[PDB]
Design a protein around this motif. Structure first.
Motif, mmCIF file in Angstrom:
data_model
loop_
_atom_site.group_PDB
_atom_site.id
_atom_site.type_symbol
_atom_site.label_atom_id
_atom_site.label_comp_id
_atom_site.label_asym_id
_atom_site.label_seq_id
_atom_site.Cartn_x
_atom_site.Cartn_y
_atom_site.Cartn_z
ATOM 1 N N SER A 22 3.499 -5.915 17.280
ATOM 2 C CA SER A 22 4.840 -6.114 16.750
ATOM 3 C C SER A 22 5.421 -7.438 17.249
ATOM 4 C CB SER A 22 5.737 -4.955 17.165
ATOM 5 O OG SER A 22 7.090 -5.191 16.821
ATOM 6 N N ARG A 24 9.267 -9.247 17.187
ATOM 7 C CA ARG A 24 10.697 -9.159 16.881
ATOM 8 C C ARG A 24 11.425 -10.489 17.086
ATOM 9 N NH1 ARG A 24 13.864 -4.593 14.796
ATOM 10 N NH2 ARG A 24 12.999 -3.185 16.381
ATOM 11 N N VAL A 56 4.300 -14.774 7.075
ATOM 12 C CA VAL A 56 4.377 -13.300 7.215
ATOM 13 C C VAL A 56 3.076 -12.540 6.853
ATOM 14 C CG1 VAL A 56 5.660 -11.157 6.588
ATOM 15 C CG2 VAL A 56 6.925 -13.313 6.822
ATOM 16 N N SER A 57 2.652 -12.632 5.588
ATOM 17 C CA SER A 57 1.561 -11.831 5.058
ATOM 18 C C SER A 57 0.371 -12.555 4.461
ATOM 19 C CB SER A 57 2.105 -10.776 4.089
ATOM 20 O OG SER A 57 2.844 -11.371 3.032
ATOM 21 N N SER A 70 2.398 -8.411 8.014
ATOM 22 C CA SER A 70 3.514 -7.889 7.244
ATOM 23 C C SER A 70 4.794 -8.030 8.070
ATOM 24 C CB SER A 70 3.265 -6.428 6.849
ATOM 25 O OG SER A 70 3.645 -5.526 7.875
ATOM 26 N N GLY A 71 5.898 -7.576 7.503
ATOM 27 C CA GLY A 71 7.204 -7.631 8.136
ATOM 28 C C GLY A 71 8.317 -7.968 7.169
ATOM 29 N N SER A 72 9.543 -7.628 7.548
ATOM 30 C CA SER A 72 10.746 -7.870 6.748
ATOM 31 C C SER A 72 11.877 -8.233 7.695
ATOM 32 C CB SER A 72 11.124 -6.613 5.961
ATOM 33 O OG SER A 72 10.060 -6.179 5.131
ATOM 34 N N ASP A 75 11.689 -8.071 11.712
ATOM 35 C CA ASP A 75 10.583 -7.227 12.197
ATOM 36 C C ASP A 75 9.255 -7.647 11.581
ATOM 37 O OD1 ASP A 75 13.229 -5.646 11.473
ATOM 38 O OD2 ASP A 75 11.867 -5.228 9.794
ATOM 39 N N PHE A 76 8.254 -8.004 12.417
ATOM 40 C CA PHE A 76 6.944 -8.479 11.946
ATOM 41 C C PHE A 76 5.749 -7.815 12.628
ATOM 42 C CE2 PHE A 76 9.028 -11.343 9.203
ATOM 43 C CZ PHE A 76 10.102 -11.850 9.893
ATOM 44 N N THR A 77 4.676 -7.544 11.860
ATOM 45 C CA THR A 77 3.502 -6.873 12.420
ATOM 46 C C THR A 77 2.172 -7.577 12.112
ATOM 47 O OG1 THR A 77 3.444 -5.355 10.556
ATOM 48 C CG2 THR A 77 4.673 -4.595 12.487
ATOM 49 N N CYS A 93 2.926 -14.678 18.025
ATOM 50 C CA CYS A 93 3.639 -14.829 16.754
ATOM 51 C C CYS A 93 4.430 -16.145 16.859
ATOM 52 C CB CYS A 93 4.519 -13.633 16.410
ATOM 53 S SG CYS A 93 5.932 -13.397 17.503
#
Ligand SMILES: Cn1c(CNc2ccc(C(=N)N)cc2)nc2cc(C(=O)N(CCC(=O)O)c3ccccn3)ccc21
Lengths: 218, 222
Positions: A22, A24, A56-57, A70-72, A75-77, A93
């Motif tokens: 994760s 943030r 992001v993706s 991914s993430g919005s 918040d990112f993963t 990140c």
């Protein structure tokens, strides 16, 4: 500045397992153009970071299929579908939406592979070093798992203290093991006082300790 | 084919200045912005700024502005980062990086320059062989190596047979001795059956003094 907080700080997963990290952001990271410039980098010790995911993706070119992002909003993963030995290192990140660009504190990925006992090797001081008035004895613990391996230097069974240094490698990117180098250094005069030089190795994979030794001068 | 060729290592006294170079090859220098990134203990990874290859102007991270001066030399296709009045906190790895698809990502990085801020003089290492013998065998396998001792400051890089030997190679992180000097070791596991035909040379590079050492590790008859 936008603080990038990664969770967990250290990720340990067994082989064949997915991995999620994760990231943030303390603020929104929407660039003025409307896009989010969120990237993922992998860094191996003493190597430059390597690009994995951008915006992001999107998976970068040449990056293995298993990696995705991914993430919005904030918040990112970072996702790994099935961890491979080559996946160990520190994942960072990074936002490039607002100046100054900022990186996360990084997440260390560890493979929790099957217990492996170390192979133990010993090296008496070389003939070259002995001519200098110093003598270094090296004990090598190779390809073991987990990293917790204890070395005890003995000189004629008397447990040594205060004259050795040791170092453990980063996790190996082929077989997920660790290796440990331990060096016992004494002056030539102190070296020539003892006969039996031994390193006693204790580890989770060893039912009883392994002792590698030599007789000085043999 | 794109390569960012960096200084490798730099040692400087506190209060002195260091100019870190990043030589561009395999692309037209003026096509992409050059970035500088610091990797320091504690603070971690930090973007310092981007230098416009056209106008020569830099957009700085406010924290490094003044302290760092980022220029771009079009006559040698080299970008430079100058840190003034060096302090111990400036000890870090300095990376130059470029992005080839607008402002989307950093796909190309230099190897990094380890800048050490210290009053202590640069000291090259001793390179002692860790010879294979009856005492370093494990079921058909023989371990051998090199002990790189008594150098200052970091880093030391090690390769085996000019990069041709990598399988089973372990270069250990340096240890700090009671004298303030560093030491590391580099080991490789090889077949014990081939000790009579193969030559194993550890190629030692103490980056700050630029000392290159090629040491042959001969088998021991013990
Ligand atoms: C801010 N900035 C950067 C800084 N680099 C950077 C790299 C990576 C990242 C990141 N990691 N996300 C973040 C920033 N590069 C930029 C490229 C353009 C651009 O669109 N062009 C095209 C127009 C033409 O053909 O000239 C362009 C190309 C070359 C020179 C000038 N302009 C605009 C703005 C830019």
């Amino acid at each position: 500045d936008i603080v990038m907080t990664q969770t967990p700080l250290s990720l340990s997963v067994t082989p064949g397992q997915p991995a999620s990290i994760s990231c943030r952001s303390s603020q929104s990271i929407v660039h003025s153009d409307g896009n989010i410039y969120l990237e993922w980098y992998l860094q191996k010790p003493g190597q430059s970071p390597k690009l994995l995911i951008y915006k992001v993706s999107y998976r970068f070119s040449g990056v293995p299929d298993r990696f995705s992002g991914s993430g919005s909003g904030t918040d990112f993963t970072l996702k790994i579908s099935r961890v491979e030995a080559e996946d160990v290192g520190v994942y960072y990140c990074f936002q490039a939406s607002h100046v100054p660009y900022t990186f996360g504190q990084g997440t260390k990925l560890e493979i929790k592979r099957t217990v492996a006992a170390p192979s133990v090797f010993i090296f008496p001081p070389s003939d070259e070093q002995l001519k200098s008035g110093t003598a270094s004895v090296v004990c090598l613990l190779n390809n073991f798992y987990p990293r917790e391996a204890k070395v005890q230097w003995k000189v004629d069974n008397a447990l040594q203290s205060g004259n050795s240094q040791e170092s453990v490698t980063e996790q190996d990117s082929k077989d997920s093991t660790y290796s440990l180098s331990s060096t016992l250094t004494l002056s030539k005069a102190d070296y020539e006082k003892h006969k039996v030089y031994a390193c006693e190795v204790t580890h989770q994979g060893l039912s009883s300790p392994v002792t590698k030794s030599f007789n000085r001068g043999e | 084919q794109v390569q960012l060729v960096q200084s490798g290592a730099e040692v400087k006294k506190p209060g002195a200045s260091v100019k870190v170079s990043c030589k561009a090859s395999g692309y037209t220098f003026t096509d992409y912005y050059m970035h500088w990134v610091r990797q320091a203990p504690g603070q971690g990874l930090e973007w310092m700024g981007e230098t416009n290859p056209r106008n020569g102007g830099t957009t700085y991270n406010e924290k490094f502005k003044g302290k760092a001066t980022m220029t771009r030399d079009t006559s040698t296709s080299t970008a430079y980062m100058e840190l003034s009045s060096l302090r111990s906190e400036d000890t870090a790895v300095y990376y130059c990086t470029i992005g080839t698809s607008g402002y989307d990502y950093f796909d190309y990085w230099g190897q990094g320059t380890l800048v050490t801020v210290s009053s202590a003089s640069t000291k090259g290492p001793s390179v002692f062989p860790l010879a294979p013998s009856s005492k370093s065998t494990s079921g058909g396998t023989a371990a051998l190596g090199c002990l790189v001792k008594d150098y200052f400051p970091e880093p030391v890089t090690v390769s085996w047979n000019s990069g041709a030997l990598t399988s089973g190679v372990h270069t250990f992180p340096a240890v700090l001795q009671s004298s303030g000097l560093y030491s590391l070791s580099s080991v490789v596991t090889v077949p014990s059956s081939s000790l009579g035909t193969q030559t194993y040379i550890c190629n030692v590079n103490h980056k700050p003094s630029n000392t290159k050492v090629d040491k042959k590790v001969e088998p021991k008859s013990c």
